[PDB]
């Protein structure tokens with residue numbers, strides 16, 4: 822099922838997600854619905870907060886062929902290094918993109934769709950996406966790294982975009 826993606830301004834996007842208690846069928850259903858939503862909306866990542874589900878669940882696919890499903894349940898950042906940035910977009914801030922400082926490489930641990938723990942060392946676009954999605958789970962949006970003035974313009978453009 823395709824779920825509705827929250828757009829700013831919406832205080833639900835600023836909520837802190839609680840850790841998933843147990844990866845059961847209900848959690849797997851959320852993960853699958855999130856992937857369906859992410860692909861339908863033509864995105865490379867989606868955090869549960871974005872679909873008004875306040876649990877630490879992220880789905881990602883940064884692959885060219887759109888067939889590399891990554892699931893991060895209760896992710897934890899273990900190590901990071903370097904700095905980089907690209908102009909990021911976000912399904913919750915439609916049609917707006919901006920350069921944000923990110924670590925170049927990150928190493929995380931999380932549970933997969935079967936609830937199995939795994940570790941992943943990421944760099945490039947995947948490291949950036951992981952950081953962006955983890956920020957969503959603690960109610961942080963990429964515009965938060967930008968000056969107050971630029972955030973103002975972003976909100977005005979999104980609000981006017983959702984009026985159409």
Ligand SMILES: [Zn+2]
Nearest residue numbers: 910911912913
């Ligand atoms: Zn986002």
